[PDB]
Amino acid sequence: MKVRASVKKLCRNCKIVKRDGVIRVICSAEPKHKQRQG
Amino acid sequence: SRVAKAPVVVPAGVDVKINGQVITIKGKNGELTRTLNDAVEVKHADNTLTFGPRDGYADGWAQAGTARALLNSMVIGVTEGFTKKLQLVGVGYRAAVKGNVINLSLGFSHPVDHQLPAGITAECPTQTEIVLKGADKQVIGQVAADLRAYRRPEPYKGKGVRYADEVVRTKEAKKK
Amino acid sequence: KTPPAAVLLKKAAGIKSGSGKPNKDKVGKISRAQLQEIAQTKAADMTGADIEAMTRSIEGTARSMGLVVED
RNA sequence: AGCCAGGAUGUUGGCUUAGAAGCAGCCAUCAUUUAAAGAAAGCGUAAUAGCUCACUGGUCGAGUCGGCCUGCGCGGAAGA
């Protein structure tokens, strides 16, 4: 798990959210699906 | 936001009074309440309401729908309240909450013994369910969620308090 | 009793599967006479005695199997 | 967008293992009822249940959306 500059693939259960202008990857069923950059 | 224009329709036991600044609320479950309209513009036609911006400001929707969502909860809060089930199913768990005090057996060094903020009342008529009484949707949720931080459910056993809906994503140990 | 038209076609055609590996495995061909032995499997559920009609469902079954209607 | 009824049928298409339960190889990609639902994308477990497309339809009802360029900011960003 890292902040990972590129967002490129998701699942339909992954919400994705924008905070302080930056995108974050987040999913209720997949604790590995975490990114903090974009 | 079409919901900010949706009528709300004030229910029984509630009374609303309106001005060009500040909205005034009375209700049989709440207390005399006023809200300042420092960023929003609100109208009330005897039993039905509408919200918007007081000057544009780009797109106009930034605060008015939030101020409306708050009002559309408040007019229920001040007459009948919100759902009041916070439940236990784990072994050796016991509810003993009373008045402003949270007493709870959850597998820790102390029975919580927490004193709560203002505007909130707690009871447990059964040892398996906590019942929260209040007219504010924010405090009734925030106290149950701040209580969620006391022994957070563990990744492979998932035991703790639930809001009458099971959500914990509890793991299974490696395969096998 | 008699089996379904599909396996009764595999008993008449040079097929061993399935069409298999192209240009290595085979399907053969079946004649109008060889079709009309299989069409008898319809002669008590179809109300008309027309042999052409009861063979149309076999020619359709042959396409559903890649089987060749060739003399 | 939300709320909500239907995601059906020929059919266990056929070969096959282990169940096949849409979610397993390879072969057939056609048909029907209708206002309307693919020989259906996908997840889910060893299997299930569950989640979830597709298409039509019920209610409010006026505007709404996804890319491809361009001026300018946003983060990307760690050193004595």
Q: Which domains occur in chain C, in start order? A: 2-70 (1.10.10.250)
Nucleotide closest to residue B175 (CA–C1'): D46
| Min Cα–Cα distance to chain B from A13, Å | 14
What method was applied to determine this entry? cryo-EM
Question: CB under 8 Å to A25, separation ≥6 — which residues?
Answer: A4, A7, A10, A14, A16, A33, A34, A35, A36
A32 CA vs D27 C1’ separation (Å):
40
Range of the domain at B133: 82-163
Which of B24, B47, B76 is the endpoint of a domain?
A: B76
Q: Which residue has the tokens 């019942």?
A: B131
State this model's resolution in angstroms: 9.0
Which of B76, B96, B112 is the endpoint of a domain?
A: B76
Residues B142 and B72 in one domain: no
C-beta neighbour count of A17 within 10 angstroms: 9
Residues B88 and B122 in one domain: yes
With H, G, I as helix, E, B as strand and everything else as coil, classify residue C26.
coil
Bridge partners, residue A19, by sequence: A22
Whether residue A31 lies within 8 A of chain B, CB to CB, comes out as: yes
Query: Is residue B97 a contact partner of residue B127, using CB atoms and an 8 Å limit?
Result: no
Residues B126 and B157 in one domain: yes
Domain CATH for B126: 3.90.930.12
* Contact between the CB of C63 and strand D at under 7 Å: yes
Q: Which residue has the tokens 């509630």?
A: B14
Residue B175 counted as domain residue: no
- Count the domains in chain B: 2
Query: Is residue B21 a contact partner of residue B37, using CB atoms and an 8 Å limit?
Result: yes
Residue B59 counted as domain residue: yes
Decide: residue B151, CB within 10 A, 0-12 exposed, 13-18 middle, 19+ buried: middle
Residue B132 counted as domain residue: yes
Phi and psi based region of residue C3 (left: phi greater than 0; alpha: psi -120 to 50; beta: remaining): beta
With H, G, I as helix, E, B as strand and everything else as coil, classify residue B133.
strand
Name A residues 4-33 whose Cβ lies under 7 Å from strand D.
5, 11-13, 20-22
